[PDB]
């Protein structure tokens, strides 16, 4: 199968800036003249929508801002200028051979000066500790950019795997993210340990941010 | 112009027929596929059914080849999807498209259909407090609402019945090992009302017809 290479991942582009979205496929897409390369725009809650055919040939209707690029294996979708429309995720797709398959997708996002995380930690409930699971939640609250390491600790032992994270969508007013960190423990586990802390490194902070408390 | 019809909850091993309606082309000519979309796995193309002269000819990815089976009925301008031996890999939002002679692009989808997957019975949420830490540096003060243990997708959480919006932020949910999912919602507040003014989470869940409301305090 054609394996689709779309970088990147997540794209910031400032207002009125370019987009640039590469896509490389793992052997050509190419025949007769005709490369074989599609691209689609998605916002959330939506379905897809075609923009580009044959890599260059834009859908009738899509604004003039839009172009494809590429031949061969390596293509390419850009947005100049970027008008606040247009962020949303975008997805090449080749249809040079069955299965048919999609590069991994690209989240325009805005890009806005940078803005350190508010670091907030908060125990269980004593209502949850009551039903036998036990779940720590540290929330950093509007910043940018996106990323950002979460590091629990537990009296100073780094916990690994027993987390997950989840993030916003950017705020629409201020174009933050905002984050919560989830450290799952059965009860008996969340008793054995006195300290319970959250660091908290990103580009906004001169020096990581740890939040904390005891057990009580 | 597209619709589609039929997803829903189902365990593994099972079985499910989902339709897809279309309109404003000519449905005889097209080549029509299916695609889903998994919630971090992107876009995956599922099955085409062409004929626009000849064959009905159907072409699978390599993966749900023999388990799903597409047809379609010309007259009635439907495309099927009927999918047996179903897993939780197949979990998605399943959309019907018109597939493209030229470019093998797919260009007219419908808004989807989902198609969830699961050992899990339908189950509404524990709502907990995520209580206001004592002291503390500006004077704003962060609480909010832990939505664990429901299934399937998906809750909605509002504050104070709708009349607190400002600064809420209800992250999406997440999977858990158990088959449940799980989200908080958190919204800052001052701190200098956290004495006068009281705060309720205010959860519905759909698939259950439930509705919870927990009053979050120090």
């Known amino acids: 199968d054609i394996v689709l290479t779309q970088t990147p991942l997540t794209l910031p582009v400032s207002p009125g800036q370019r987009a640039t979205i590469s896509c490389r496929a793992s052997?050509?897409?190419?025949?007769?003249?005709?490369?074989?390369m599609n691209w689609y725009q998605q916002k959330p809650g939506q379905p897809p929508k075609l923009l580009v055919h044959?890599?260059?040939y834009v859908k009738s209707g899509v604004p003039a801002r839009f172009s494809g690029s590429g031949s061969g294996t390596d293509f390419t979708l850009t947005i100049h200028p970027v008008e606040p429309e247009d962020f949303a995720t975008y997805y090449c797709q080749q249809g040079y051979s069955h299965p048919w398959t999609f590069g991994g997708g690209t989240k325009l996002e805005i890009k806005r000066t940078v803005a350190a995380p508010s670091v907030f930690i908060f125990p269980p409930s004593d209502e949850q500790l009551k039903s036998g699971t036990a779940s720590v939640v540290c929330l950093l609250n509007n910043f940018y950019p996106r990323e950002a390491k979460v590091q629990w600790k537990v009296d100073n032992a780094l916990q690994s795997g027993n987390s997950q994270e989840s993030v916003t969508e950017q705020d629409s007013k201020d174009s933050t993210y905002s984050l919560s960190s989830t450290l799952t423990l059965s009860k008996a586990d969340y008793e054995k340990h006195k300290v319970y802390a959250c660091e908290v490194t990103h580009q906004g902070l001169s020096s990581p941010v740890t939040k904390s408390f005891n057990r009580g | 112009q597209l619709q589609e019809t039929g997803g829903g909850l189902v365990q593994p091993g099972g079985s499910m027929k989902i339709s897809c309606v279309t309109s404003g082309f000519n449905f005889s000519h097209a080549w029509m596929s299916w695609v889903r979309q998994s919630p971090g796995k992107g876009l995956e193309w599922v099955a085409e059914?062409?004929?626009?002269?000849?064959?009905?000819?159907?072409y699978y990815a390599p993966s749900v080849k023999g388990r799903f089976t597409v047809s379609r009925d010309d007259s009635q301008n439907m495309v099927y999807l009927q999918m047996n031996n179903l897993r939780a890999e197949d979990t998605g939002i399943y959309y019907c498209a018109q597939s493209s002679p030229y470019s093998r692009a797919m260009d007219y989808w419908g808004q989807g259909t989902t198609v969830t997957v699961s050992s899990a019975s339908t189950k509404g949420p524990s709502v907990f407090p995520l209580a206001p830490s004592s002291k503390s540096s500006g004077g704003t003060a962060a609480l909010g609402c832990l939505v664990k243990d429901y299934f399937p997708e998906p809750v909605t959480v509002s504050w104070n019945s709708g009349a607190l919006t400002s600064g809420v932020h209800t992250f999406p949910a997440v999977l858990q090992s158990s088959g449940l999912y799980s989200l908080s919602s958190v919204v800052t507040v001052p701190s200098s009302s956290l004495g006068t003014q009281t705060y309720i989470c205010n959860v519905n869940h759909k698939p259950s017809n439930t509705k919870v409301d927990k009053r979050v305090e120090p």
């Open positions: 059914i062409r004929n626009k002269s000849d064959g009905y000819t159907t």
């Open positions: 052997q050509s897409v190419d025949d007769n003249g005709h490369s074989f």
């Open positions: 044959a890599a260059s």
